[PDB]
């Protein structure tokens, strides 16, 4: 059922690898070969120069679930490879880099390069393990790449339904027309609110436990790119809030924090700043998430919600330029000497982004053990200072 496509410039070994991993034609779509302990289909993306590559790459992006991006290890990273990379940056779908005929290979921006040969199949196992890892994550409900998917999570009666209705009643919104989701456009950009049916579960059904609701909310998070954590401004923070937000964070989702029912809070001039500080104290892992105060009832600041979801989604998807990234890391090291360890100092050689959603970075070092968590946080904050990344977690991995 999973679909795999091989993409790259001419003469990197695509046919050779394709013919090896493919079995019989289905009816172009081929099933995977007998010798493979993986079950999946292959799509042939046969079809100027840039125009022809783009044609192939876009077919893969539409029809496949995982893409193998193949380069030629004998010819190094060519300018034409860098061009294919740029096209492939346009997809959210998993891309695995295979370096055939066996760096700067990390410089392509897709993380670990998998060395292979089409002669005697060296490296194939590891490559196929890496592709197959993605299968479990393939979305059950698929939407066009352009659609931004988000969810609202929060305890019962916080105002999720009311926020959604307040949000959808805006002049900028056109509600459309899988019947669990709600589709709409906002400034003509397409959005999906994941599993609105679960919010409307009440009125048809009694809630006799929250355990299934919690688990259903986790599924909605898995399907979303942005998660709006809605808190009740009247009752304050509770443990269930921390737990579901922690899940979102660990799942690498973009997060926006929404304080609803602000109309009902007895305010002085510092009631908002105190609430904000109370949130930062209870959700110490969500420093990147903006906090929004609104009222679904009076509509106060309702108009700020969609722009915050857009911004978090943008930052979640943000791909940085490598040369700039390295300048930022060297500036960081310049201002703050690296940790030492009984005579051995951490040295940083090179940094690159390896994925998006969330933004993930690899730092090439001396030895990863000398990279302490506190220095890692420091690097993260310097990256945030230079590029923004408001609304999204980021990941930093040290490698030797
Ligand atoms: N040395 C070596 N040559 C290869 C390997 N894989 C493919 N080739 C050769 O490279 C050329 C391009 O192969 P092909 O599969 O047509 O690549 P495509 O143009 O990307 O489909 C052919 O002459 C192949 O015989 C490999 O692993 N090692
Ligand atoms: N005062 C006030 N009440 C609200 C607000 N939003 C929702 N409510 C009320 O809180 C209750 C629960 O709202 P609902 O949208 O069903 O919350 P849900 O369980 O998260 O969907 C309803 O009686 C709403 O009218 C708000 O901004 N201010």
Swiss-Prot record:
Positions of GTP 1 binding: 8-15, 44-47, 100-102
Q: What is the source species?
A: Bacillus subtilis (strain 168)
Miscellaneous note, as given in the UniProt record, is: Estimated to be present at 7000 copies per cell.
Which PROSITE patterns does the annotation name? Answer: G_ENGA
Query: Gene deleted: what happens?
Result: Essential for growth, it cannot be disrupted. Depletion experiments show that cells become longer and abnormally curved, with nucleoid condensation. Cells have many fewer 70S ribosomes; the large ribosomal subunit is 45S and is missing proteins L16, L27, L36 and interacts with 2 large non-ribosomal proteins.
PANTHER family found in the cross-reference section = GTPASE DER (PTHR43834:SF6)
**Single GO biological process annotation from the record:** ribosome biogenesis
CDD domains assigned: EngA1, EngA2
Q: What is this protein called?
A: GTPase Der
Enumerate the HAMAP family for this protein: GTPase_Der
Mind listing the UniProt keywords for this protein, alphabetically?
GTP-binding, Nucleotide-binding, Repeat, Ribosome biogenesis
Which residue ranges does the record assign to the KH-like domain?
318-400
Similarity-based family: Belongs to the TRAFAC class TrmE-Era-EngA-EngB-Septin-like GTPase superfamily. EngA (Der) GTPase family.
């Amino acid at each position: 059922k999973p679909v795999v496509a091989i993409v790259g410039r001419p003469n990197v070994g695509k046919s050779t690898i394709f013919n090896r991993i493919a079995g019989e034609r289905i009816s172009r779509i081929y099933s995977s070969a007998e010798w493979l302990n993986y079950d999946f289909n292959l799509i042939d993306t046969g079809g100027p120069f840039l125009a022809q590559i783009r044609q192939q790459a876009e077919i893969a992006m539409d029809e496949a679930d995982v893409i193998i991006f193949m380069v030629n290890g004998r010819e190094g990273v060519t300018a034409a490879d860098e061009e294919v990379a740029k096209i492939l940056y346009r997809t959210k779908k998993p891309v695995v880099l295979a370096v055939n005929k066996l760096y700067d290979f990390y410089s392509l921006g897709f993380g670990e390069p998998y060395p292979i040969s089409g002669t005697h199949g060296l490296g194939l196992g590891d490559l196929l393990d890496a592709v197959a890892e993605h299968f479990k994550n393939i979305p059950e409900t698929k939407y066009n790449e352009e659609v931004i998917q988000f969810c609202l999570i929060g305890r019962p009666n916080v105002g999720k339904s009311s926020l959604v209705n307040a949000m959808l009643g805006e002049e900028r919104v056109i509600v459309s027309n899988d019947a669990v989701d709600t589709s709409f456009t906002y400034n003509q950009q397409e959005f999906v609110i994941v599993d609105t049916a679960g919010m409307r579960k009440k009125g048809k059904v009694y809630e006799t436990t929250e355990k299934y609701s919690v688990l259903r909310a986790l599924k909605a998070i898995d399907r979303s790119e942005v998660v709006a954590v809605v808190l009740d401004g009247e009752e304050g923070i509770i443990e269930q809030d921390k737990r579901i937000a922690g899940y979102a964070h660990e799942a690498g989702k973009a997060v926006v924090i929404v304080v609803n029912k602000w109309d009902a809070v007895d305010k002085d001039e510092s009631t908002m700043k105190e609430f904000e500080e109370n949130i930062r104290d209870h959700f110490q892992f969500l420093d990147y998430a903006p906090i929004l105060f609104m009222s679904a009832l009076t509509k106060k600041r309702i108009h700020t919600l969609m722009p915050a979801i857009i911004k978090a989604s943008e930052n979640h998807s943000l791909r940085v330029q490598t040369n700039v990234l390295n300048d930022v890391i060297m500036d960081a090291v310049a201002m703050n000497p690296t940790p030492t360890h009984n005579g051995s100092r951490l040295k940083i050689y090179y940094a690159t982004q390896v994925s998006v959603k969330p933004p993930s970075f690899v730092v090439f070092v001396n030895d990863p053990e000398l990279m302490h968590f506190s220095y890692e946080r420091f690097l993260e904050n310097r990256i945030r200072d230079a590029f923004g990344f408001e609304g999204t977690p980021i990941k930093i991995f040290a490698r030797a």
